Design a protein around this ligand. Structure first.
Ligand SMILES: [Zn+2]
Ligand SMILES: [Zn+2]
Ligand SMILES: [Zn+2]
Length: 289
């Protein structure tokens, strides 16, 4: 908008407050010093910013570059991203490894096609309702438990939710345009939601870790198997703790004088569309005295 253009020549150091960042602008327009002056035409000129691992704590000043389309800003020290809020022409925004937790500034970025926020400690991704046009979304290595908002992001061909804490992938059942789905290291016990996902080329389901609602230290104990495949059918465990034994459809046991938590491990090669993956994880079942 209006005073998100500078009208007299100005020195970099002054418009871009953060030193690291002021230097990515210098290094990008091939200038020789941050004290050198820049005119808005030159700023208008900038389409891409490559600034990974560059120790950037603030992108203030970025507001003055309204034709910027691709922002590579991984592994910096960003927390507040408001100066992006209004860069209408943004399509790639890479903010891995920062600490950006409030996605409200992305909300009017309606040309944004690919967003990455791996490893930011995000837990609420509901701000994503404001961005249905997304094509690639990388949300790996956060603390996301609820993905119900994703049933709306129907334009995705690439989605990574690897290493969060998802029990429930029913919200993905709809997203049939999906080609690469990474769901490793979550709490996924039921693969039914993926029956539909026919265009999948790459799919990952390693290391699920599913925990249960406690019961009690019984000599004869008999928990039912809840791990289900694509198509509804109970997957047969690839090993049980504590000379445990599986007769359909329960893990049985026999105890008194050892301890409090029991478990079983499962394994199942799956095929959905043109993709082949390994659904391998563990059902825990803790007990009390
Ligand atoms: Zn909002
Ligand atoms: Zn035994
Ligand atoms: Zn195994």
């Amino acid at each position: 908008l209006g005073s998100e253009t500078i009208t007299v020549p100005t020195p970099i150091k002054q418009i871009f407050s953060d030193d690291a960042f002021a230097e990515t602008i210098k290094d990008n327009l091939k200038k020789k010093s941050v004290t050198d002056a820049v005119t808005q035409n030159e700023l208008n000129s900038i389409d891409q910013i490559i600034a990974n691992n560059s120790d950037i704590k603030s992108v203030q000043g970025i507001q003055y570059l309204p034709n910027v389309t691709k922002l590579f800003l991984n592994g910096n020290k960003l927390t507040d991203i408001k100066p992006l809020a209004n860069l209408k022409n943004l399509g790639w925004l890479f903010l891995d490894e920062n600490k950006v937790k409030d996605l409200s500034s992305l909300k009017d970025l309606k040309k944004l096609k690919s967003l990455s926020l791996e490893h930011n400690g995000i837990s609420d991704i509901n701000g994503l309702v404001h961005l249905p046009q997304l094509e690639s979304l990388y949300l790996g290595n956060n603390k996301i438990t609820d993905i119900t908002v994703l049933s709306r992001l129907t334009k995705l061909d690439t989605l990574s939710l690897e290493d969060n804490q998802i029990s429930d992938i029913v919200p993905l059942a709809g997203l049939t345009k999906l080609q690469n789905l990474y769901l490793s290291k979550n709490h996924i016990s039921d693969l039914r939601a993926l029956a539909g996902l026919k265009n999948l080329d790459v799919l990952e389901l390693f290391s699920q870790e599913c925990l249960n609602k406690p019961i009690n230290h019984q000599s004869n104990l008999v928990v039912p198997n809840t791990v289900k495949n694509t198509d509804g059918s109970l997957v047969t465990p690839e090993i049980i703790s504590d000379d445990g034994d599986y007769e359909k459809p329960n893990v049985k046991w026999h105890l008194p004088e050892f301890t409090n938590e029991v478990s079983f491990i499962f394994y199942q090669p799956v095929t959905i569309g043109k993709a082949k993956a390994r659904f391998h994880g563990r059902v825990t079942q803790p007990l009390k005295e």
